[PDB]
């Protein structure tokens, strides 16, 4: 019996992995669960087909190298990698990882979170993000659909394809001019907090202009100091063209949320990245006092550093590096 297929997509991961089930898909990849007939468990498998585009090749190499170096309870790992025995044959790369029960996206579509769970999930997101930022890496695309949850309420951050060393509903406002710094991740976590408090996106713009209006609709018109953070000229001009907007207090939007939760949300969703809170201070905020435990919150031993200029490399070079990096999982290595 030939190779497995999932929604007309071949999934050439047997004989070890079988009984595939669709989970989701991105721009150049698909995710399924499968049965691992060695460890007698179900696993997650992300198929990645990036080699047509230099950008996809950089993100794939970055994703693999970062996830193989990171070792943290709140961050998805890589257990196995499958690809063809020769570089000429390699069209796809399959990354095998721990299977989780669901993601925060789906959870928030069907469940109301107690203040306790919101607190505990927020702690874990930030605890993972502390490890991440401690290594001088940015995730850059945190969102409910890549925060994974287990039966026992354990959370893991996944999809590091966009990560870099230091929808669009979670993009910080600095980015909607563009400057990727650690504070864009805190913005995303702020938006995630809001969504956990209400079950609806806080800034659900149809496009970037419409997202800016949502943001200003709650934060109010930016100050002049805040306007000096907005480097891009079209954006700055646009902001200067708008009528004044008043700041809406957080407890009017979330009338039944914990006061501490709202005080932290306020500091995470701050227009000016320079004044936005940082991950350790977030973790030490009173709202999180029930879980904050710096004695058991690991950081990376050293800053992550790429020794090559991936941006500069032609997609053929990248593919060779991807062949190299995945060698160690190939039989007979
Ligand atoms: C419906 N039934 C399947 C339940 C369910 C629902 C969602 C998740 C999981 N479990 C799980 N376990 C391990 C992993 Cl590794 C992943 C995973 C999902 S997506 C992804 C990634 O890399 N995704 N990117 C592309 C898609 O958009 C987001 C980013 C990794 N999921 C189970």
Author numbering: 9 to 174, 190 to 201, 204 to 358
Q: What did the published study say regarding this structure?
A:
Currently, the abnormal activation of RAS-RAF-MEK1/2-ERK1/2 signaling cascade has been confirmed in more than 33% of tumors, and it is considered one of the most important drivers of malignant progression, invasion, and metastasis of tumors. By utilizing the principle of polypharmacology, we computationally designed SKLB-D18, a first-in-class molecule that selectively targets ERK1/2 and ERK5, with nanomolar potency and high specificity for both targets. The co-crystal structures revealed that SKLB-D18 occupies the ATP-binding sites of both ERK2 and ERK5 simultaneously.
SKLB-D18 tightly occupies the ATP-binding sites of ERK2. The 2-aminopyrimidine group is anchored in the ERK2 kinase hinge regions, forming vital bidentate hydrogen bonds with Met108. Additionally, the chlorine atom at the 5-position of pyrimidine forms a halogen bond with the gatekeeper residue Gln105. Ultimately, the 3-((dimethylamino)methyl)phenyl moiety, extends into the solvent-exposed region, contributing to the enhancement of physicochemical properties. Structural analysis revealed that the SKLB-D18 in complex with ERK1/2 establishes a more extensive interaction network compared to its binding with ERK5, as evidenced by (1) additional hydrogen bonds at the binding interface, (2) enhanced hydrophobic complementarity, and (3) optimized electrostatic interactions. Meanwhile, the structural alignment showed that the binding mode of SKLB-D18 to ERK1 is similar to that of ERK2. SKLB-D18 exhibits nanomolar potency against ERK1/2 and ERK5 with half-maximal inhibitory concentration (IC50) values of 38.69 ± 0.62 nM, 40.12 ± 0.95 nM and 59.72 ± 1.21 nM, respectively. The isothermal titration calorimetry (ITC) assay further confirmed the binding affinity of SKLB-D18 to ERK1/2/5, with a dissociation constant (Kd) of 126.9 nM, 209.8 nM and 468.2 nM, respectively.
